[PDB]
């Protein structure tokens, strides 16, 4: 397994690296917010994951919005993520576990991680998102959340990858390559895109804070339209995976879920529990499952 062959993960410059400080290149599959999709939140969607579409990290989408959130009930939220983490040390992957909020929730993160941190801090395959995809904020202001928020799980688990998004949802790069986060190791900032709405400058966003000592993880990538439907830009796929596989910078496609949007890569009839044969499969799972089969 990845987790096996790679053990602890390091950033060391920009580069997502293995215990012995070789790069790691991570691709996988977000699970869809758990909140909406949570009958995937299970330990058999998870062994699939690695086992067929050979994913090397899963993500774990604890909802912070919509109805039935962490906030409103945290107890079905912490039902959904343990299995996910569980099985993906069962099964020798790295896991996500990501808040997924747009919102500012200080206070809820901080007590959170610091359970999550208590809890599973000493295996590898943890990596922790502090915040999802924040909108409408200037970056000083996450960049305090994320100071704050990194000082709580850094006293617990003072090694393992945490990944710090930045506003406009993750496309403030080029804010935080400016302002960077000092004196914390082992860190990466995320960086989401969507094939079909978000044209090169992304990408060359993105480039610019890598040059500048900006580490990038993309912890949620898709083909589709930036709303999670539209159309499915392949070819503009093609040249987002390629672009990042020429980087080496780790991605996840998102999302493992089945509504009627192009970015849910399952259909209504799929097992809660896998073994999705190939008229299961929506286009973009195809090409997610091709995706990630063929790099790793
Ligand atoms: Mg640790």
């Not at 991680?113 to 996450?142: H, S, T």
Request: net charge negative.
């Amino acid at each position: 397994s990845i987790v096996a062959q790679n053990g602890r993960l390091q950033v060391i410059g920009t580069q997502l690296s293995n215990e012995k400080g070789e790069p790691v290149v991570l691709r996988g599959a977000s699970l869809g917010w758990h909140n909406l999709w949570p009958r995937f939140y299970n330990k058999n969607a998870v062994q699939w994951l690695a086992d067929d579409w050979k994913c090397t990290v899963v993500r774990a989408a604890m909802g912070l919005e919509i109805e039935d959130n962490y906030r409103e009930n945290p107890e079905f939220a912490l039902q959904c993520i343990t299995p996910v983490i569980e099985s993906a040390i069962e099964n020798g992957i790295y896991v996500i576990i990501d808040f997924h909020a747009h919102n500012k929730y200080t206070e809820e993160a901080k007590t959170f991680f610091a359970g999550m941190a208590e809890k599973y801090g000493e295996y590898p395959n943890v990596i922790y998102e502090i915040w999802n995809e924040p909108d409408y904020f200037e970056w000083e202001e996450v960049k305090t959340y994320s100071e704050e928020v990194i000082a709580v799980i850094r006293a617990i688990d003072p090694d393992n990858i945490i990944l710090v998004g930045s506003p406009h949802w993750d496309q403030d790069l080029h804010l935080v390559a400016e302002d960077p986060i000092r004196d914390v190791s082992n860190i990466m900032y995320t960086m989401h895109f969507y094939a079909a709405t978000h044209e090169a400058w992304l990408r060359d966003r993105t480039d610019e804070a890598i040059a500048k000592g900006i580490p990038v993880f993309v912890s949620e990538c898709g083909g589709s339209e930036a709303n999670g439907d539209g159309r499915l830009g392949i070819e503009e796929w093609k040249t987002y995976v390629d672009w990042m596989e020429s980087r080496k910078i780790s991605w996840v496609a998102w999302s493992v879920s089945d509504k009627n949007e192009t970015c849910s890569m399952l259909l209504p009839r799929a097992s809660a529990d896998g073994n999705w044969t190939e008229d299961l499969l929506k286009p973009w799972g195809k090409l997610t499952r091709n995706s990630i089969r063929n790099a790793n």
